[PDB]
């Protein structure tokens, strides 16, 4: 009788996954003119 044993290595298996997300943000409004240069009263003529 021997009963003699052996020894191995520590083998482990795992599944890893990292995830993320996305969101789009928008801000708009109906045009009521716009930032202009030389905002002055005018007198058009044809």
């Amino acid at each position: 009788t021997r009963v003699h044993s052996y020894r191995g290595v520590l083998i482990i298996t795992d599944e890893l996954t990292v995830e993320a997300g996305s969101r789009v943000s928008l801000s708009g409004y109906v045009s009521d003119g716009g930032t202009s240069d030389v905002f002055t009263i005018c007198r058009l003529l044809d």
């Binding site: 599944e15 996954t17 990292v18 995830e19």
Partner: protein, 108 residues
């Protein structure tokens, strides 16, 4: 939100190439706790906003080491993704870690 077509295009540029294990959560200072060597990892083409590893990779963990977290370093030495494993494991002797599959996903 992004489109399925949009996600596929964007994912085709991350291209992780190597994976490094860690002992502490590598959030910030990812260059520290570099327990293992940069073993190469191959990823497939984007599909439905998801890339998966092409094959199983084996990590040559050194003896008397503990690994709990990993990181996917790309070609130009950038840490693009951190992450934890199932449970912190102590590699008391020499051993190898088997990564069955790692998948990057944006469908969330």
């Amino acid at each position: 939100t992004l489109t399925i077509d949009g996600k596929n295009k964007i994912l085709a540029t991350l291209t992780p190439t190597t994976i490094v294990l860690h002992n502490v959560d590598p959030t910030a200072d990812p260059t520290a706790n570099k327990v293992t060597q940069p073993v190469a990892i191959f990823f497939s083409e984007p599909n439905n906003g998801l890339i998966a590893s092409e094959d199983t990779v084996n990590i040559t963990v050194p003896a008397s080491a503990t690994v709990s977290h990993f990181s996917l370093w790309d070609d130009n030495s950038k840490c693009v993704a951190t992450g934890a494993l199932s449970s912190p494991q102590f590699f008391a002797e020499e051993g190898i870690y088997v990564i069955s599959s790692v998948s990057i996903d944006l469908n969330k």
